[PDB]
Subunit: 77 residues, 16 copies
């Protein structure tokens, strides 16, 4: 079981710091992304690809990934 | 016992970060949802379907799920 | 030993987040309930039944349950 | 070693959240009780009987119990 | 090894919450006691006896005990 | 599984304090670097070479490394 | 490995709460001592003897000890 | 594996409190040192020798050591 | 020119403390009223009549009046 | 136009510090009184008689008076 | 020179509390409106008509008016 | 009209800084006095005489005077 | 002497709320503009024209004007 | 009526910044002096002589003077 | 007596907002300039020329001017 | 009566912003100077001469002057 999860293109997130991993396709999460962009809490790890998952961490950073949310979780192993 | 729980339509929550999982069936939890919406702490994981469970996390985010609360809790085990 | 406790009618609370579980029948806890209602920290999980237990969590949420307080604690197992 | 301790009349406290359990027998702890009453941090679990122990928790709540302090501590074990 | 330590006359302190246990016989700790008295963080558990130890907890409460400081620590066992 | 990870040129980071390790390849992470520079939270461990990984720690420090992000993560194991 | 360390003359410190143990031999640590004195965070456990070690705890208290820093650390083990 | 690490000349740091150990030879870490000096968070444990490592702790103290950074980490054992 | 303005049924407001006087008939001001009710900043001076004006003061209190907003302002004289 | 207004039984308030003077006749102002009582911001100048006016000051103190609100305001002039 | 300015449909603003009066014609002021809406600082005095002026007050409230900005300012004088 | 008011025995208060001057004979003002004593905001200018007036200032200091409250106000002239 | 100053195209600023009016042509003021944009404190009143003056107000809003800075000040009259 | 008042030995205070001028003759004002000393808000203008007046300013600084309180106040006028 | 002062090259400052106008000729004011630069409170009105005066305003902004401090002050009068 | 006071060598202070002007020759004011130095609130306007007056302003800046304190005040005129 991994401490660090590959969220695509070599970018890594600590599993123990994740609160939730969700789809980017509704208004509340879009509000969270724009808030993070304004506050300097946004990290874009999609490396030019479509955003498929939004990772919210306990430091209240918001990380964009090109990977399916369930796949990010699956990569714990 | 799992680290991440599928709360419907591929959306995942860390089990250790959950405080409570309740029905959306009364005024106080509805106040909590609207507060979270205003503050940018709301996450809607229902994928357009009826809200069946409201998840409050220790980061004081509020997550809407389309599955019953007991279903979220039962999925702690594989 | 459970991580999540059924506090009645399918509603769940994380055991590790509970500070105290008390009866609702005196002035100080009633002050705590009304404070939580005003602050948006109250959760009513009694599902139309009489409040039998008041659960205070470490996030300072206040959760109303229809179950006896000792029974909520017993459900840890 | 128990997670929840019965402090009398069915009222329960999480053992890991307790900082100290003391007698109500002097001015400083009485100051702490009145401060908690004013701030909405006081919990009275005495069920109308004499206060015998004062429990201070890490959330800086103050809980009144009708059982002796050593009795609260001893109940940590079944 | 105990979770709760008897600090005299039945009064109990959680061992994991203690930062330091010191003698009350110098100016800096006396400043700490008076600050706690003013702030409502002082607890007097000496039950009418001479203060022999001052316990500082992580919640920044200050607890007076009639017991030798090394004896309080010894009571962990 | 190691406590400290060498991120290049002798510089060390505590593994348990890392939140994320990402490429410096877009505007949001560059915003994070400049914010840290202004606030005195930036640490440059590149030893004059090209930045290949950006480490964000739970203390909300930002650490620049000359090694690829996957290399930082792989070094968790000896 | 002990929970409490005797730092001289019966005074005790929780090992898990210590951040650093250093000599009082330079201006920065002396600044830290004077700041703690002003703020009411200083604890003098030297019992009237020369300060040999300065203990900084996670509660940002500052504790003066009459024993060498290596002696405080060595006493972690019985 | 040690709880306390000797960072030179008898000075000790708790390993679990360290965030990062870096060289002092660039502008950002020098900003961190000067900030700590102004704020009263700086600790100089070099005991008159050249600074070889800068230790940042979770309490946001900054500790100067005369030892190589990798050597400080090696001393965990 | 008055220091105190009669806002109906003998209730008085200091003119110099008023920021704005508006109609209660749209969503944003209704949000302001409900926020004030929750926070303990609401004052209801309508004395059982329909709310015709909402007074926002510099202390961020919200005062309900039964009088037309322009009439409240006119009463400055 | 006076600086100090007699609000009954010798008690005085600075006119320039008053925000509003209202009847105690509804739930919101009663919430304000109880909040002030809990916080130590309440001043009772009624001298044991029925409360007829509630004065809120810019320091967010709450003062109870036994005279009608219009009487407080009229006394601004001698 | 008036204390209160009619900003349309009977709605009034204290002139001394106004910081700026601008057109709603660009992204930054629209950001300010949406921020105020989320925070409960927005006041809509347009009475259902097109927004022509945005008033920012020193209490950091944001007030929407249906009259041109120059009209608000000109009404300072009777 | 004075800037400074003699509140007895040579002690002076700036008139423009006073919020209210009240009798000390009820529970709420006694709470205010004890709060100020604990917080280091209390000033006792009675010079050994009975407290007749309690002065609350905008800095939230609380000043005890031996003079009738209406007399303190009268001394503005 | 005006209370409100026309800063171009009908946009108005209260003169008493202005701290400084400066040219936009150097790095520090550009930092101030970008900070305000991120924080939601920026107001763009240039109405599609080149920015000629940057107005900093006491509420720490930043207002862009198409008018020369000295001309904005001149319009006080 | 003067802007600056000489409080002895050339030391000056702005009259408009003074809240109260009192004797140092009781425990509460002594608490205020010691608090100011600890916080770095104390100013000693006595030039080595007995403290006769204690000046509290709106910046919550505390200034010690060697002249009687009535003398400070009387010097408001030339 | 003017409301706005020209501090060189068309840049204007409100006279009532100025706390102090000093030479850039020592370490403490240079510390103030660098702090303002880091925090986004610095304004450079020198138009590329040597700094001759440093203006600190009540909003704790720091403004660099190319004119001597006495020149800024003298321009208060027309 | 001046708005700005010359405090020596062309350096200017706004009279309305001054709280107190005192001699630098005792421990409490020296604590205030060192605090200001650490916090970045110190301004040294002595231009290489002996400090004769310490000016404390309402923004809690501390300004060193080479002029007698009573002379600074006299320069109001």
């Amino acid at each position: 079981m991994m401490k660090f999860i590959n969220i695509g293109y070599g970018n890594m997130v600590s599993a123990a710091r994740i609160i939730t991993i969700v789809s980017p396709d509704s208004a509340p999460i879009k509000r969270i992304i724009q808030d993070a962009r304004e506050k300097g809490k946004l990290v874009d790890a999609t490396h030019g690809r479509a955003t498929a998952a939004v990772i919210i961490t306990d430091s209240d950073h918001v990380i964009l990934s090109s990977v399916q949310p369930e796949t990010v979780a699956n990569r714990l192993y």
